[PDB]
Amino acid sequence: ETVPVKLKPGMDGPKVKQWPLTEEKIKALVEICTEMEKEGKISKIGPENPYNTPVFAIKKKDSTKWRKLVDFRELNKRTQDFWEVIPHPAGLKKKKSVTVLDVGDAYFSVPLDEDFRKYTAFTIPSINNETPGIRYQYNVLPQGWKGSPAIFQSSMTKILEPFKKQNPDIVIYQYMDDLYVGSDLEIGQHRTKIEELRQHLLRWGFLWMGYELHPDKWTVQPIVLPEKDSWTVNDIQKLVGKLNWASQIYPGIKVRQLSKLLRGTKALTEVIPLTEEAELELAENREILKEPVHGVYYDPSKDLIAEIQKQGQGQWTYQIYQEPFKNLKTGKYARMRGAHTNDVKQLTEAVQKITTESIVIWGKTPKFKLPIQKETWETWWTEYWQATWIPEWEFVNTPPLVKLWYQ
Amino acid sequence: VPISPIETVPVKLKPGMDGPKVKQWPLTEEKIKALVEICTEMEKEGKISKIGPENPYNTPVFAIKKKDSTKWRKLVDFRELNKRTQDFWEVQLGIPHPAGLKKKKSVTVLDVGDAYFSVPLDEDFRKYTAFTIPSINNETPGIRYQYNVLPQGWKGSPAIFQSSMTKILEPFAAQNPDIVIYQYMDDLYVGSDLEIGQHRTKIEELRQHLLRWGLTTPDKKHQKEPPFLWMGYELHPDKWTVQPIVLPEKDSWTVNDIQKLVGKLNWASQIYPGIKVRQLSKLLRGTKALTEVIPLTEEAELELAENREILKEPVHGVYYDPSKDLIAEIQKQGQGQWTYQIYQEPFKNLKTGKYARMRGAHTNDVKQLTEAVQKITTESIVIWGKTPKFKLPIQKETWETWWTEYWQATWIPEWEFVNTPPLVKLWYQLEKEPIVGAETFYVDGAANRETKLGKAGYVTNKGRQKVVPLTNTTNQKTELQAIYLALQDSGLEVNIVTDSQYALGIIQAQPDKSESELVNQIIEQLIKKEKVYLAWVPAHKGIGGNEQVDKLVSA
Numbered sequence A: 001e002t003v004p005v006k007l008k009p010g011m012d013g014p015k016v017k018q019w020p021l022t023e024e025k026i027k028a029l030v031e032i033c034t035e036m037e038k039e040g041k042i043s044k045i046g047p048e049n050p051y052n053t054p055v056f057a058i059k060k061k062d063s064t065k066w067r068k069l070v071d072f073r074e075l076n077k078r079t080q081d082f083w084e085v086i087p088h089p090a091g092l093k094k095k096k097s098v099t100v101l102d103v104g105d106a107y108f109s110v111p112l113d114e115d116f117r118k119y120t121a122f123t124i125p126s127i128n129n130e131t132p133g134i135r136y137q138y139n140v141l142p143q144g145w146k147g148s149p150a151i152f153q154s155s156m157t158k159i160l161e162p163f164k165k166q167n168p169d170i171v172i173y174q175y176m177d178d179l180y181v182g183s184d185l186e187i188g189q190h191r192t193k194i195e196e197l198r199q200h201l202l203r204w205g206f207l208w209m210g211y212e213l214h215p216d217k218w219t220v221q222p223i224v225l226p227e228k229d230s231w232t233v234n235d236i237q238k239l240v241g242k243l244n245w246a247s248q249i250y251p252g253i254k255v256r257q258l259s260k261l262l263r264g265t266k267a268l269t270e271v272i273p274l275t276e277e278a279e280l281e282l283a284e285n286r287e288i289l290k291e292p293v294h295g296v297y298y299d300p301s302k303d304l305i306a307e308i309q310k311q312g313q314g315q316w317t318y319q320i321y322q323e324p325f326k327n328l329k330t331g332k333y334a335r336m337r338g339a340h341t342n343d344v345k346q347l348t349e350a351v352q353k354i355t356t357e358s359i360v361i362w363g364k365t366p367k368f369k370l371p372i373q374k375e376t377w378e379t380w381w382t383e384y385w386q387a388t389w390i391p392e393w394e395f396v397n398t399p400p401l402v403k404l405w406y407q
Numbered sequence B: 001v002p003i004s005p006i007e008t009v010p011v012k013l014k015p016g017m018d019g020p021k022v023k024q025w026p027l028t029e030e031k032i033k034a035l036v037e038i039c040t041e042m043e044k045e046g047k048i049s050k051i052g053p054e055n056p057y058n059t060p061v062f063a064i065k066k067k068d069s070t071k072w073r074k075l076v077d078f079r080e081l082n083k084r085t086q087d088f089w090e091v092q093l094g095i096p097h098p099a100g101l102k103k104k105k106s107v108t109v110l111d112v113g114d115a116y117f118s119v120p121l122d123e124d125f126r127k128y129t130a131f132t133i134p135s136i137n138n139e140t141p142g143i144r145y146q147y148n149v150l151p152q153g154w155k156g157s158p159a160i161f162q163s164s165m166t167k168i169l170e171p172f173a174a175q176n177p178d179i180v181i182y183q184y185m186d187d188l189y190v191g192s193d194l195e196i197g198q199h200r201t202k203i204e205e206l207r208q209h210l211l212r213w214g215l216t217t218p219d220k221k222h223q224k225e226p227p228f229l230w231m232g233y234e235l236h237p238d239k240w241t242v243q244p245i246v247l248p249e250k251d252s253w254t255v256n257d258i259q260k261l262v263g264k265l266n267w268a269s270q271i272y273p274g275i276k277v278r279q280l281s282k283l284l285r286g287t288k289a290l291t292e293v294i295p296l297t298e299e300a301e302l303e304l305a306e307n308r309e310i311l312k313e314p315v316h317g318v319y320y321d322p323s324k325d326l327i328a329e330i331q332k333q334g335q336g337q338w339t340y341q342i343y344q345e346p347f348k349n350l351k352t353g354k355y356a357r358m359r360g361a362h363t364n365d366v367k368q369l370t371e372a373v374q375k376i377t378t379e380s381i382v383i384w385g386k387t388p389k390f391k392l393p394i395q396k397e398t399w400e401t402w403w404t405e406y407w408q409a410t411w412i413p414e415w416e417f418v419n420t421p422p423l424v425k426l427w428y429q430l431e432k433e434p435i436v437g438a439e440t441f442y443v444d445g446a447a448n449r450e451t452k453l454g455k456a457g458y459v460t461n462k463g464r465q466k467v468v469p470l471t472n473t474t475n476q477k478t479e480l481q482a483i484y485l486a487l488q489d490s491g492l493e494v495n496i497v498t499d500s501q502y503a504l505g506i507i508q509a510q511p512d513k514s515e516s517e518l519v520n521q522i523i524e525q526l527i528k529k530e531k532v533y534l535a536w537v538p539a540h541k542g543i544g545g546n547e548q549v550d551k552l553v554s555a
């Protein structure tokens, strides 16, 4: 049977243009859709259906099996809002380990309400516009649709009752196509319970992949002031600048003693010995920075904003917040990936990592502000994307001064 | 002999709307007899059907003489029904670009101006297509008709016809992967490479395939044969171009004339290499309104004149050979203009093109080159489904220095340096640490919001000082002026300390050309220095060099 669904009142279906696809992606999508059509998952549609949602292809990693990904951002925003009868696992973020599981295939075993199907239309375009684009619409619950985990909930709730009752300490959370499973087990039983879980699912009617995370191992990032034996006028100028900035987050910060070191027009490279009034003030200020911020709270009706700064030689810093200067999370990615060759691949990898963390902690994705030209991002993100969801984003074109102060 | 019917598409009016109820216009006795004759055969052919008085919808019908012929033609004005008809999925959004097509030995053109009326219109939607032929003298109830097939002029006819035609051709194309089929309009075009011997066979098989739907296709030699005039181009069996581009010879140019010229040069730029249009589009800075008869700067005539020497003789592009690699070459022209050519074999261009920077006051060559590359990349994906290999005028070393130090993430796909001046280069590099032994200039500006008077100056560690009185100026301006003074009065190496976020935001943006001559002067100064370290400090935090110079310019 089919639980009904409608759009938010005011609102017609999505009419989003399909963006140019490379030849490799088109062949992959043609092959995939051909077999999904055979299987009744999707059906060809006519011109009386004016809706459209973008679609592209992504090879999950270290592999050669393409996935088809539909960008339901617009439909999601546009489809009414599906309360049931979750708010959040405040302890998923606490659990030693967490394994992420692709359970999206389950969705294709529930039919979609015939009156809503038209809204899931998508086009596989042709190179150089030479033949008409192949049009299709979903007949079953589609992956990437927010209605999808919601409607299927009931069915997933009872599909997991056995495992959940026999393992009352394991935390299982579900976001879009993804099942998040967290436990303090030692990292080898943890795997047994997982590869159990899926055998317990793959009985129950590519879920073999795993992405292990360690929330207890994340990796926050306060502000730090340098510890030096000899300070030049420039070191002190940079220090006073950083402290002036931090005083916008922490009220007790004070500079005056450090500022009064730089009395006179001195050469930037001149060494300046610190007064005891200075070295006290610097000390009290270090203390204040070890305390956490004041009045910082999450307000689940508000959007999460994520900012990212390129710190060079492969490092990237970021902050998540809802209110300016009220950081809920800050971090750094002095990882490898991506370069030393490719800036954009690194940025794409960072966005995915931050999104994953945001899902685990608050159960929703943040709106990204990206240090890159819109034209450069749009032309390349899909070539490195590997997640089944897609967050929102906007572009930053003015270099932020606070760049250094977060590294 | 049985024939498969053509399934109809369910059509609806937009929600909340009802059919059209437009009044029929009064016609001349002559036009009515003509319409009656015309409608009579259409009805005999099944295209339309007489309807009762129940139907309350109406659409105006007209009669237009055909280029002064002995014949008449009927025009049903569906503008009003079109506003109330649902939206459809246009699958002829874009036309394919000539540079993307494959070369075909043989290409036949089959007409289907008849198969268009074998396409039925959804039964429940027919009532909305009602129209009325007025009666002679208005003495009898006008003849009422409604359509049974896709009406010419109705919003959905194109989409429904094209999709119906595609659905029929779908199995033929698939089964015959050695031919290409394109449904532009009412004539069907089929190309191929196989010897004309068997290419004629394929055509006969297609006509046979179309007979399954009782669509006949009319067994003559269509008037259309290579070359074809299509979408502003000339398509030939092995080559393509634009059509004829002719630049008027004029003693007077008015906003329109220049807009018309820019249009031709833009359209021509896809195959004619080198085309420039900056000095022209610059003369149309921004108004709506023809005409004005604006004059041509000594650059417009020089830049345009160079155009004529490009379009002097015909230039043709080749077609795409999938088995061969695509290569894109870019050259800087200056004034923020760039030109590129895409080819697979040396000197044999598939297509060419230009790029122009967007609105902005500060920019640099590297950023412009990058934008050009992204544009070419996108266009390439659309036309060939792949990214070309790039040949660019910039040294690998320059590019590396640039992207590793730029605050934004950036990327260019697989490319190679091509040594053809003018090369793109980095004009100056700020230093990462303060310079030892170099004089430290603490700069500042200030201006009175009201009087607009300000001061710009600096003080250094060596006691050097300066404060200059300024008129007609803003805070942001004064702060840029102070930096300029420090640059002017310092040696080849220098440390500059400012408190202006605005000035830093501009130099951190790393421009090599600007719309503000102030910034241009500064740029010119940076270029002449050996080493420059720009430092920033917060205003009013009790700092030397800064607290002093601030007092000197505040007044």
Ligand SMILES: Cc1cc(/C=C/C#N)cc(C)c1Nc1ccnc(Nc2ccc(C#N)cc2)n1
Residues within 6 Å of the ligand: A130, B096, B100, B101, B102, B103, B104, B107, B180, B181, B182, B184, B189, B190, B191, B226, B227, B228, B229, B230, B235, B236, B237, B238, B319
């Ligand atoms: C887009 C298109 C327009 C017309 C025609 C439209 C009109 N009028 C005719 C055809 C057959 C096609 N389609 C394709 C697809 C792939 N390669 C080609 N090659 C190709 C086309 C025409 C000539 C010529 N002469 C040579 C090669 N054409």
Ligand SMILES: C=C(C)[C@H]1CCc2c(c(C)cc(O)c(=O)c2O)C1
Residues within 6 Å of the ligand: B444, B445, B446, B499, B500, B539, B540, B550, B554
């Ligand atoms: C509140 C103040 C002390 C005044 C006076 C100087 C002054 C002020 C401001 C806003 C900005 C500057 O960049 C600056 O250099 C100033 O000297 C404001």
Ligand SMILES: [Mn+2]
Residues within 6 Å of the ligand: B444, B445, B479, B499, B500, B539
């Ligand atoms: Mn200032």
Ligand SMILES: [Mn+2]
Residues within 6 Å of the ligand: B444, B445, B446, B539, B550
């Ligand atoms: Mn000042």
